[PDB]
Design an enzyme around this catalytic site. Structure first.
Site, mmCIF file in Angstrom:
data_model
loop_
_atom_site.group_PDB
_atom_site.id
_atom_site.type_symbol
_atom_site.label_atom_id
_atom_site.label_comp_id
_atom_site.label_asym_id
_atom_site.label_seq_id
_atom_site.Cartn_x
_atom_site.Cartn_y
_atom_site.Cartn_z
ATOM 1 N N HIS A 212 -9.323 -15.839 6.542
ATOM 2 C CA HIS A 212 -9.620 -16.907 5.591
ATOM 3 C C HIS A 212 -10.817 -16.632 4.673
ATOM 4 O O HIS A 212 -11.149 -17.451 3.811
ATOM 5 C CB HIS A 212 -9.795 -18.233 6.344
ATOM 6 C CG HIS A 212 -8.503 -18.807 6.848
ATOM 7 N ND1 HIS A 212 -7.598 -19.362 5.987
ATOM 8 C CD2 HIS A 212 -8.222 -18.739 8.168
ATOM 9 C CE1 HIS A 212 -6.585 -19.699 6.860
ATOM 10 N NE2 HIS A 212 -6.944 -19.325 8.202
ATOM 11 N N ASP B 3 -18.842 1.992 11.205
ATOM 12 C CA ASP B 3 -17.439 1.824 10.813
ATOM 13 C C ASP B 3 -17.109 2.961 9.842
ATOM 14 O O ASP B 3 -16.225 2.832 8.995
ATOM 15 C CB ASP B 3 -17.196 0.473 10.117
ATOM 16 C CG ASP B 3 -15.710 0.171 9.915
ATOM 17 O OD1 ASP B 3 -15.377 -0.634 9.020
ATOM 18 O OD2 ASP B 3 -14.872 0.724 10.656
ATOM 19 N N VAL C 170 -7.641 -5.044 3.449
ATOM 20 C CA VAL C 170 -8.679 -5.816 4.121
ATOM 21 C C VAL C 170 -9.661 -6.558 3.217
ATOM 22 O O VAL C 170 -10.015 -7.700 3.507
ATOM 23 C CB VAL C 170 -9.477 -4.942 5.126
ATOM 24 C CG1 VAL C 170 -10.472 -4.050 4.396
ATOM 25 C CG2 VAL C 170 -10.182 -5.839 6.131
ATOM 26 N N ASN D 21 -12.248 4.522 0.586
ATOM 27 C CA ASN D 21 -11.426 4.074 1.701
ATOM 28 C C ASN D 21 -10.048 4.743 1.625
ATOM 29 O O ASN D 21 -9.939 5.876 1.156
ATOM 30 C CB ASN D 21 -11.309 2.543 1.671
ATOM 31 C CG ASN D 21 -10.998 1.950 3.040
ATOM 32 O OD1 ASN D 21 -9.982 2.273 3.650
ATOM 33 N ND2 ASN D 21 -11.872 1.074 3.522
ATOM 34 N N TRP D 22 -9.000 4.051 2.067
ATOM 35 C CA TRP D 22 -7.651 4.628 2.063
ATOM 36 C C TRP D 22 -7.026 4.848 0.682
ATOM 37 O O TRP D 22 -6.061 5.603 0.560
ATOM 38 C CB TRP D 22 -6.693 3.769 2.901
ATOM 39 C CG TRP D 22 -6.434 2.424 2.297
ATOM 40 C CD1 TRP D 22 -7.206 1.306 2.429
ATOM 41 C CD2 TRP D 22 -5.380 2.079 1.388
ATOM 42 N NE1 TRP D 22 -6.704 0.289 1.654
ATOM 43 C CE2 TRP D 22 -5.583 0.735 1.004
ATOM 44 C CE3 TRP D 22 -4.286 2.779 0.855
ATOM 45 C CZ2 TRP D 22 -4.732 0.072 0.111
ATOM 46 C CZ3 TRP D 22 -3.438 2.118 -0.034
ATOM 47 C CH2 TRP D 22 -3.669 0.777 -0.396
ATOM 48 N N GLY E 292 -6.772 -0.112 15.097
ATOM 49 C CA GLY E 292 -7.176 -1.159 16.018
ATOM 50 C C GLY E 292 -8.595 -1.012 16.541
ATOM 51 O O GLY E 292 -9.015 -1.766 17.420
ATOM 52 N N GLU F 85 0.795 -1.228 0.000
ATOM 53 C CA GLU F 85 0.000 0.000 0.000
ATOM 54 C C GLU F 85 0.827 1.277 0.000
ATOM 55 O O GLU F 85 0.277 2.375 0.009
ATOM 56 C CB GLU F 85 -0.925 0.027 1.227
ATOM 57 C CG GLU F 85 -1.927 -1.116 1.290
ATOM 58 C CD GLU F 85 -2.972 -0.921 2.371
ATOM 59 O OE1 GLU F 85 -3.877 -1.777 2.481
ATOM 60 O OE2 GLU F 85 -2.892 0.083 3.111
HETATM 61 C C1 HEC Z 1 -5.136 -14.028 10.380
HETATM 62 C C2 HEC Z 1 -4.568 -13.286 11.608
HETATM 63 C C3 HEC Z 1 -5.706 -15.428 10.624
HETATM 64 C C4 HEC Z 1 -6.768 -15.781 11.349
HETATM 65 C C5 HEC Z 1 -7.730 -14.886 12.183
HETATM 66 C C6 HEC Z 1 -6.911 -17.229 11.200
HETATM 67 N N1 HEC Z 1 -5.923 -17.730 10.385
HETATM 68 FE FE1 HEC Z 1 -5.688 -19.645 9.817
HETATM 69 N N2 HEC Z 1 -4.106 -19.131 8.747
HETATM 70 C C7 HEC Z 1 -3.549 -17.854 8.605
HETATM 71 C C8 HEC Z 1 -2.392 -17.907 7.732
HETATM 72 C C9 HEC Z 1 -1.525 -16.688 7.342
HETATM 73 C C10 HEC Z 1 -2.243 -19.194 7.329
HETATM 74 C C11 HEC Z 1 -1.162 -19.729 6.364
HETATM 75 C C12 HEC Z 1 0.168 -20.173 7.015
HETATM 76 C C13 HEC Z 1 1.111 -20.649 5.927
HETATM 77 O O1 HEC Z 1 2.124 -19.988 5.659
HETATM 78 O O2 HEC Z 1 0.778 -21.701 5.346
HETATM 79 C C14 HEC Z 1 -3.306 -19.954 7.960
HETATM 80 C C15 HEC Z 1 -3.523 -21.314 7.800
HETATM 81 C C16 HEC Z 1 -4.531 -22.068 8.365
HETATM 82 C C17 HEC Z 1 -4.761 -23.497 8.165
HETATM 83 C C18 HEC Z 1 -3.903 -24.391 7.254
HETATM 84 C C19 HEC Z 1 -4.468 -24.190 5.821
HETATM 85 C C20 HEC Z 1 -3.931 -25.058 4.698
HETATM 86 O O3 HEC Z 1 -2.671 -24.992 4.511
HETATM 87 O O4 HEC Z 1 -4.733 -25.725 4.035
HETATM 88 C C21 HEC Z 1 -5.841 -23.839 8.883
HETATM 89 C C22 HEC Z 1 -6.500 -25.224 9.005
HETATM 90 C C23 HEC Z 1 -6.328 -22.641 9.544
HETATM 91 N N3 HEC Z 1 -5.498 -21.578 9.205
HETATM 92 C C24 HEC Z 1 -7.426 -22.536 10.357
HETATM 93 C C25 HEC Z 1 -7.901 -21.407 10.962
HETATM 94 C C26 HEC Z 1 -9.084 -21.354 11.800
HETATM 95 C C27 HEC Z 1 -9.988 -22.552 12.132
HETATM 96 C C28 HEC Z 1 -9.217 -20.065 12.200
HETATM 97 C C29 HEC Z 1 -10.292 -19.440 13.088
HETATM 98 C C30 HEC Z 1 -10.240 -19.899 14.560
HETATM 99 C C31 HEC Z 1 -8.139 -19.312 11.626
HETATM 100 N N4 HEC Z 1 -7.335 -20.134 10.868
HETATM 101 C C32 HEC Z 1 -7.920 -17.957 11.780
HETATM 102 C C33 HEC Z 1 -4.060 -16.726 9.203
HETATM 103 C C34 HEC Z 1 -5.162 -16.637 10.023
HETATM 104 O O1 LIG Z 2 -10.640 1.179 12.779
HETATM 105 C C1 LIG Z 2 -9.340 1.222 12.623
HETATM 106 O O2 LIG Z 2 -8.476 1.447 13.491
HETATM 107 C C2 LIG Z 2 -8.869 0.935 11.224
HETATM 108 C C3 LIG Z 2 -7.531 0.738 10.897
HETATM 109 C C4 LIG Z 2 -7.143 0.325 9.566
HETATM 110 C C5 LIG Z 2 -5.634 0.140 9.292
HETATM 111 O O3 LIG Z 2 -4.842 0.485 10.195
HETATM 112 O O4 LIG Z 2 -5.281 -0.289 8.193
HETATM 113 C C6 LIG Z 2 -8.226 0.124 8.591
HETATM 114 C C7 LIG Z 2 -9.573 0.391 9.073
HETATM 115 N N1 LIG Z 2 -9.868 0.777 10.324
HETATM 116 C C8 LIG Z 2 -10.849 0.274 8.241
HETATM 117 O O5 LIG Z 2 -11.972 0.533 8.720
HETATM 118 C C9 LIG Z 2 -10.715 -0.187 6.728
HETATM 119 O O6 LIG Z 2 -11.708 -0.285 6.068
HETATM 120 C C10 LIG Z 2 -9.305 -0.470 6.297
HETATM 121 C C11 LIG Z 2 -8.866 -0.924 5.051
HETATM 122 C C12 LIG Z 2 -7.492 -1.054 5.139
HETATM 123 C C13 LIG Z 2 -6.529 -1.533 4.058
HETATM 124 O O7 LIG Z 2 -5.321 -1.503 4.351
HETATM 125 O O8 LIG Z 2 -7.016 -1.884 2.967
HETATM 126 N N2 LIG Z 2 -7.114 -0.671 6.410
HETATM 127 C C14 LIG Z 2 -8.179 -0.327 7.127
HETATM 128 CA CA LIG Z 3 -12.207 0.515 11.032
#
Ligand code: HEC
Ligand SMILES: O=C(O)c1cc(C(=O)O)c2c(n1)C(=O)C(=O)c1cc(C(=O)O)[nH]c1-2
Ligand SMILES: [Ca+2]
Length: 664
Positions: A595, A295, A525, A382-383, A171, A59
């Site tokens: 996800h 929001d 996002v 947005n941004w 945040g 970005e």
């Molecule tokens: C962002 C902060 C995340 C949230 C919230 C959740 N997950 Fe996640 N998940 C994230 C990443 C960046 C990755 C990839 C890691 C890599 O480098 O491979 C994943 C991966 C998974 C997987 C494995 C997927 C696959 O390889 O097929 C699973 C099963 C998974 N995540 C589950 C999961 C669930 C159940 C969540 C909610 C409680 C959840 N994730 C949140 C990033 C993020």
């Molecule tokens: O409520 C917050 O503090 C906050 C922070 C940010 C951020 O730091 O990127 C976003 C937002 N809100 C938001 O509402 C939003 O739609 C958003 C889009 C993005 C992006 O990087 O595409 N950031 C953010």
């Molecule tokens: Ca916001």
């Protein structure tokens, strides 16, 4: 020793360099450079490019000074690139813990750095403001601006005003108290801090403005929930008036019925603040969205300009925030000059000129029934940067049209270690292509009407750039870089960038030659919440710094086709409706933000519907035992029980089968 106020102000007439985020302190993102114009842009080509070890959203708006390009990448990393050789001079990696993304709402992004003296400044996802030596990239000073224990993060670019580095944070989605600070450019010592919302009544107000703001809040829960009002993006500065303009964000939680039950404007949420840079004292404010419950941030681009209104020269401040109204204010005193809709807006009938307050439509605060309205949390704008062309007098906006759906969780609201909107954001299971659209909108601030409009199939396109050559540049979600005539919006030049673009283009001059650069890296996002609309052709991340120039002859290589992928044939998933439903909700509350809504991933993070059998077998280990923690996949043992994770897995498999049967 280098970049100072005089230098940044001088760029107002000299187009060679770009020393601040929005180019000039007025943040018009308008370059006087005109070697490339509407008559010859058809000859524009790729001059050179740099592949980046980056797979998340890019970005950043690059800065250019004395032959060097200063920019950032995902995870708050900074790099300096020699514009003549195209070689990376140095890079700084703050080494942000990948799991920090669990408390970073909108992708591991960074909008750019700032320059002052002989240093480079950057804000990090984990709350640090760091000063780096411009020549070598070595860290000079670092400040932990936020409480590491709280869900804060920094994604925006800092600006430097009168020797003070200004930075906010984000945040509000998780629940935090907003504020903007000024740190000494040479030492990092905190000069002053302006909180945008009041804190615990049991403690003193940090400054007098908060005492007054407190009168607009109700109940005893807002300070525990954070309050919101984060200053995560835009700000501007007028040295003549000696005023620092800052935009504040949405409330925490989003839903005022929970945040401030008794009502109230809740100052200074969704407001434009005019602050004295030397002291942090508020000169004036204008609340864009009183009692914000959608929001609806006011952190969008703030542009200063001089316009002739009703035959009189006015010193204005313009903004096109998420709520859909285009604001023109007198920047000397904050008086509202005009405010009109620049797109589909149904939450309000209009903004009453006399009161300056929006006239809300019936039921938009969704107290008794959920509401479907426009704009949405994604915002009408947005941004993604907008730009102003003093020559045409128009403002080019990356307009977005997406439906917003809000539900009052009310008494059933429960604070979690995840998004805390209290507005049923977790209910979303998709973002259909049929309900979204975008457009490059050329807005006339004086007439408060569209001059021209170029339509795009979806929202989430990149920022704009205006130049004296009657041109406006913009990158798209579909994967192209564009150039249109500034006056009429005629398509003049297109390029296949190989990546969706969300960042804003910038331009500079080197050895008498004009270059246009863009950080190409699909993200933000929207790419995380996903949905059908975010899975159209071209919406893929192939991170690169692309630099164009007249008669550029560089060519991007063809990507290699994806390997073989025999999709698993899903066995029927039998389960109690309530069990699947429980999984649907838990998933929406804790996993959708990364996800994808309804498990419809955006491609930056794995699609749980496509997980391998081995992965499915280790579902509990991954989700509750942090088996993939080093890769950024957080462990949720602090919020979910094994049986709950199983309900989520059930839901995920249900969607896989549901979708697999769709085809065939
Ligand atoms: C962002 C902060 C995340 C949230 C919230 C959740 N997950 Fe996640 N998940 C994230 C990443 C960046 C990755 C990839 C890691 C890599 O480098 O491979 C994943 C991966 C998974 C997987 C494995 C997927 C696959 O390889 O097929 C699973 C099963 C998974 N995540 C589950 C999961 C669930 C159940 C969540 C909610 C409680 C959840 N994730 C949140 C990033 C993020
Ligand atoms: O409520 C917050 O503090 C906050 C922070 C940010 C951020 O730091 O990127 C976003 C937002 N809100 C938001 O509402 C939003 O739609 C958003 C889009 C993005 C992006 O990087 O595409 N950031 C953010
Ligand atoms: Ca916001």
């Amino acid at each position: 020793a280098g970049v100072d106020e005089a230098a940044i102000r001088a760029t107002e007439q000299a187009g060679g360099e770009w020393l601040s985020h929005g180019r000039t302190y007025a943040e018009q993102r308008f370059s006087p450079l005109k070697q490339i114009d509407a008559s010859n842009v058809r000859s524009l080509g790729l001059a050179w490019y740099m592949d980046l070890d980056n797979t998340r959203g890019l970005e950043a708006t690059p800065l250019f000074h004395d032959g060097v390009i200063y920019t950032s990448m995902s995870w708050s990393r900074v790099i300096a690139v020699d514009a003549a050789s195209g070689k990376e001079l140095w890079r700084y990696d703050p080494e942000v813990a990948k799991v920090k993304a669990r408390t970073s709402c909108c992708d591991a992004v960074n909008r750019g750095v700032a320059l002052w003296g002989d240093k480079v400044y950057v804000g990090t996802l984990d709350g640090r403001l760091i000063a780096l030596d411009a020549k070598t990239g070595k860290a000079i000073w670092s400040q932990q601006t936020t409480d590491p224990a709280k869900p804060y993060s920094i994604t925006g670019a800092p600006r430097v005003v009168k020797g003070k580095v200004i930075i906010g944070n984000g945040g509000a989605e998780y629940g935090v108290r907003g504020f903007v600070s000024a740190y000494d450019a040479d030492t990092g010592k905190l000069a002053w801090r302006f909180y945008t919302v009041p804190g615990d009544p049991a403690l003193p107000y940090e400054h007098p403005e908060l005492r007054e703001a407190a009168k607009t809040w109700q109940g005893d829960q807002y300070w525990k929930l954070g309050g919101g009002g984060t200053v995560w993006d835009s700000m501007a500065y007028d040295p003549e008036l000696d005023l620092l303009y800052v935009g504040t964000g949405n409330g925490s939680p989003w839903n005022r019925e929970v945040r401030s039950p008794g009502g109230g404007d809740n100052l200074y949420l969704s407001s434009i603040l005019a602050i004295r840079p030397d002291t942090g004292k508020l000169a004036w404010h204008y609340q864009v969205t009183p009692g914000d419950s959608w929001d609806f941030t006011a952190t969008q681009q703030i542009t200063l300009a001089e316009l002739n209104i009703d035959g009189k020269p006015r010193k204005v401040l313009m903004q096109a925030p998420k709520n859909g109204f285009f604001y023109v204010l007198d920047r000397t005193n904050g008086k509202l000059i005009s405010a009109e809709k620049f797109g589909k807006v149904t939450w309000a009938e209009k903004v009453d000129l006399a009161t300056g307050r929006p006239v809300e439509a019936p039921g938009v605060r969704y107290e008794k029934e959920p509401i479907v309205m426009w704009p949405s949390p994604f915002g009408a704008h947005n941004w993604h940067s907008m730009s102003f062309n003093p020559g045409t007098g128009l403002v080019y906006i990356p307009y977005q049209e997406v439906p917003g759906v809000y539900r009052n969780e009310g008494k059933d609201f429960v604070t979690r270690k995840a998004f805390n909107t209290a507005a049923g954001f977790a209910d979303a299971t998709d973002v259909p292509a049929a309900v979204v659209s975008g457009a490059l909108l050329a807005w006339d601030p004086v007439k408060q009407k569209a001059a021209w409009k170029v339509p795009y199939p979806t929202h989430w396109n990149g920022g704009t750039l205006s130049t004296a050559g009657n041109l406006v540049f913009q990158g798209t979600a579909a994967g192209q870089m564009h150039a249109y005539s500034a006056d009429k919006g005629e398509a003049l030049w297109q390029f296949e960038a190989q990546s969706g673009i969300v960042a804003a283009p910038m331009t500079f001059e080197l050895a008498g030659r004009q270059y246009v650069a863009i950080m190409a890296g699909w993200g933000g996002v929207a790419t995380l919440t996903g949905g059908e609309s975010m899975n159209l052709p071209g919406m893929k991340n192939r991170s690169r710094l692309l630099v164009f120039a007249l008669d550029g002859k560089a060519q991007l290589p063809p990507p290699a086709p994806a390997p073989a992928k025999v999709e698993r044939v899903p066995q029927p998933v039998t389960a109690a409706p309530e069990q699947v439903q429980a999984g649907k909700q838990l998933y929406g509350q804790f996993c959708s933000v990364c996800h994808g809504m309804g498990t419809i991933s955006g491609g930056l993070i794995p699609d749980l519907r496509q997980s391998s059998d081995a992965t499915r077998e280790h579902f509990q280990q991954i989700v509750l035992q942090g088996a993939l923690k080093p890769l950024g996949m957080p462990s949720f043992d602090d919020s979910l029980k094994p049986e709950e994770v199983e309900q989520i897995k059930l839901y995920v498999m249900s969607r896989e089968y549901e979708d697999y049967m769709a085809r065939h």
